[PDB]
C-alpha cells in the first residue's frame, strides 16, 4: 500500500483532507514533533510536499476552513493557530489553560467560527480575528474527542462524559447522554440519515469496542447497539484501543483503526464487517477520507498504548493512502 513522501519525524496525532471547495486534494498531518505538514495528493498516487508550520509543543488536531483557504491547528502548547496557506503565514486565534485536544470549523447560515475543545474542561468559540472567546462552554471533564456536522456536535470527556449540541443560532447543550460504553472514551464520528442530516454518532472506547447511537430512533432498545472490534483472536483474546473513526462521506459505511495496527471497514445498518486489514509493524494512530471518499488515509505510529517503554524513537512513522472506493460499498 502506497506511502507518502517525507513523512513526519515523530508520531502522528491527526489527519485531515481539504474541503471540496478546493481543486484537487490536500492532506494535513500533525505530529508529536510539534509540526504540521501539508501535501498535495495527486491521482497518480504521488505526493508533493507543499508547506509546514510550527507549534512549541505536540499538535493534537487539525482541520480546514469551509472555503479551503485556512488550516486550523490544535496543540499542547495551549494554543490554536490559523494558517493561511497562500502566504504561508500563521497566527494565534485561540488560548486555553491546558492543551487543546479538538479543533473544528462551524459554518452556519447565521454565523461562522472555530470550536476548540480542551483538557481545561471547556469548549470555546472563536471568530478568528478577535482574542476574546465569543462563547465559552463548561464541560463536565477533560475534553477527549469531538465531532462537528451542522447543526449537531458531539463531545466526549474524561469519566465517560458524552454530550450532544445544537448549532442553530448560538450553540447550546442538546442532550447529556449516559454513555453506552463502560470504558474510557477515545474517538467519535457523526453519521447522517438517507435525507443527509446529522442523525447519530459512532463512539470508540479503549476496550476494543464501538457504540452506535441514534439521537431519535423508533426503538432505542434495538436500534442503539454496540459491537466489538480490534481484537486479536483456547488462548486469551487481546483487546486494543480504537484510536480513530471516520464515516464514508458518500456511502454511509465507516472506517475504524486501532492499537493492534489494523484498519476495518463496517456496515452499521447491515451490522456486518466488510474488511479487516493485515497487521502492521506498529499501531494505527489516525485516519480519514478525502472530500469525496476515494482515498483512505491512515498513519502508522506508536500511540503510547503500552507506556514509555515500548517507544522506539528510531522507527519510521508512515502515512498510507489506499485508493479504495470499491472496498467501501454495501450489498
Amino acid at each position: 500500500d502506497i506511502e507518502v513522501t517525507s513523512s513526519p519525524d515523530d508520531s502522528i496525532g491527526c489527519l485531515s483532507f481539504s474541503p471540496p471547495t478546493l481543486p484537487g486534494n490536500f492532506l494535513i498531518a500533525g505530529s508529536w514533533a510539534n509540526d504540521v505538514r501539508c501535501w498535495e495528493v495527486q491521482d497518480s498516487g504521488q505526493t508533493i510536499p507543499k508547506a509546514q508550520q510550527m507549534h512549541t509543543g505536540p499538535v493534537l488536531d487539525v482541520c480546514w476552513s469551509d472555503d479551503g483557504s485556512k488550516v486550523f491547528t490544535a496543540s499542547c502548547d495551549k494554543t490554536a493557530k490559523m494558517w493561511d496557506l497562500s502566504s504561508n503565514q500563521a497566527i494565534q486565534i485561540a488560548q486555553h489553560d491546558a492543551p487543546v485536544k479538538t479543533i473544528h470549523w462551524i459554518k452556519a447560515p447565521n454565523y461562522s467560527c472555530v470550536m476548540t475543545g480542551s483538557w481545561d474542561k471547556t469548549l470555546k468559540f472563536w471568530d478568528t480575528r478577535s482574542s476574546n472567546p465569543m462563547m465559552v462552554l463548561q464541560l463536565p471533564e477533560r475534553c477527549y474527542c469531538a465531532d462537528v456536522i451542522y447543526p449537531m456536535a458531539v463531545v466526549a470527556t474524561a469519566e465517560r462524559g458524552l454530550i450532544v449540541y445544537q448549532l442553530e443560532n448560538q450553540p447550546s447543550e442538546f442532550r447529556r447522554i449516559e454513555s453506552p460504553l463502560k470504558h474510557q472514551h477515545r474517538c467519535v464520528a457523526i453519521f447522517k440519515d438517507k435525507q443527509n442530516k446529522p442523525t447519530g454518532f459512532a463512539l470508540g472506547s479503549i476496550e476494543g469496542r464501538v457504540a452506535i447511537h441514534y439521537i431519535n430512533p423508533p426503538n432505542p432498545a434495538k436500534d442503539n447497539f454496540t459491537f466489538k472490534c480490534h481484537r486479536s483472536n483456547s488462548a486469551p483474546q487481546d483487546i486494543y484501543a480504537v484510536n480513530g473513526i471516520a464515516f464514508h462521506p458518500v456511502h454511509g459505511t465507516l472506517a475504524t483503526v486501532g492499537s493492534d495496527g489494523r484498519f476495518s471497514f463496517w456496515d452499521k445498518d447491515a451490522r456486518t464487517k466488510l474488511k479487516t486489514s493485515e497487521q502492521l509493524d506498529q499501531p494505527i494512530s489516525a485516519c480519514c477520507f478525502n472530500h469525496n471518499g476515494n482515498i483512505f488515509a491512515y498513519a502508522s505510529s506508536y500511540d503510547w498504548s503500552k507506556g514509555h517503554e515500548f517507544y522506539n524513537p528510531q522507527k519510521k512513522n508512515y502515512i498510507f493512502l489506499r485508493n479504495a472506493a470499491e472496498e467501501l460499498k454495501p450489498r
Partner: protein, 54 residues
Amino acid sequence: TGTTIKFNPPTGTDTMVGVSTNISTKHQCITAMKEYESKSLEELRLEDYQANRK
C-alpha cells in the same frame, strides 16, 4: 506523573457470538490499569515528554 509503573495488561472474561462461546481477555492498553485509569494516552505521553522520559 508519567508511565513509571511498568506495563501489565489487566485480565477479564467475556462472551463471544450465532456460535455462542466463552473466553478470557488481556486488555492491551495501559489506561486499563487501575494506576493510570484517570488519564488518557495523550495525557500520559505528554507527561513523559516533559519529564524527558522518552
